[PDB]
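Hi P.,

Sorry for the delay on this. The queue was packed all week, but I finally got your sequence through. Input first:
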Amino acid sequence: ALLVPDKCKFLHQERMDVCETHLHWHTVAKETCSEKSTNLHDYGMLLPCGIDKFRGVEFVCCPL
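Then the structure:
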């Protein structure tokens, strides 16, 4: 479980049809925080579908 601090927002994204890399998900997360002028505070991999493969990510974006 992730603590959500200092008025940051919690976001999850999950696609049954998708089994992708950590590298993929870290970018998605980072591009989503970035897109709203907020930083990626940290993240977590959802549903292992293989070595370095997952179907989702949860993450925390904080205000600049």
